[PDB]
Design a protein around this ligand. Structure first.
Ligand SMILES: Cn1ccn2c(CCNC(=O)[C@H]3C[C@H]3C(=O)O)nnc2c1=O
Length: 167
């Protein structure tokens, strides 16, 4: 038993809810919250900027030190950093940004990072301002992630469409 509440069951291990991921992280304090990161860990906008804003920019400060030491991530890759006030850990995962011209085939590799964690709170990778179709992202998630993933969908109308179109 875990502390996630009101999630809709898609598969044995994947649940989904219409939720603001910042508010959800604050309430649950999950072991792992997933950030929709870019390779530079520049959290200007999107989920990245939203989670970073909720940490009072401490996520960005930690991230800049990480990049200065290690260099950029790979598209499809990830790193584990602090979850600050939102979670124990933040798994920064880089899904391909379609609007930047990046290769959408890399979405499966991005979701494979989730399998290194038993339970995660996460957004739909590559969706929103990353430019991929969210229906596709959900399909890749379900077909790739084997650990327990709680998907927080911000957009109410999208949430309804994702549930009603799920095979
Ligand atoms: C406080 N907060 C919370 C969330 N948020 C977002 C989420 C952005 N959309 C996505 O990640 C797309 C997958 C689809 C969705 O989940 O609706 N953008 N800005 C914020 C923000 O300020």
């Amino acid at each position: 038993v875990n502390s996630f509440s009101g999630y809709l069951k898609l598969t044995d291990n994947v649940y989904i809810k219409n939720a603001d991921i910042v508010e959800e992280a604050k309430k649950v304090k999950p072991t792992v919250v997933v950030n929709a990161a870019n390779v530079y860990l520049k959290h200007g906008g999107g989920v990245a900027g939203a989670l970073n804003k909720a940490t009072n920019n401490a996520m960005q400060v930690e991230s800049d030190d990480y990049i200065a030491t290690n260099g950029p991530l790979k598209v499809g890759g990830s790193c584990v950093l602090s979850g600050h006030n939102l979670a124990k850990h933040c798994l920064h995962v880089v899904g391909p940004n379609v609007n930047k011209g990046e290769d959408i085939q890399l979405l499966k590799s991005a979701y494979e990072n989730f399998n290194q964690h038993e339970v995660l709170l996460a957004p739909l990778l590559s969706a929103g301002i990353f430019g991929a179709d969210p229906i596709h992202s959900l399909r890749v998630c379900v077909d790739t992630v084997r650990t327990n993933v709680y998907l927080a969908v911000f957009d109410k109308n999208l949430y309804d469409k994702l549930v009603s179109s799920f095979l």
